[PDB]
Write a structure and sequence with these properties.
The protein has 12 residues and is mainly β. The chain has no helices and 2 strands.
Length: 12
């Protein structure tokens, strides 16, 4: 998964 999150662009 890749998305926008706390640290700009975030992937998990």
């Amino acid at each position: 998964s890749c998305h926008f999150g706390p640290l700009g662009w975030v992937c998990k």
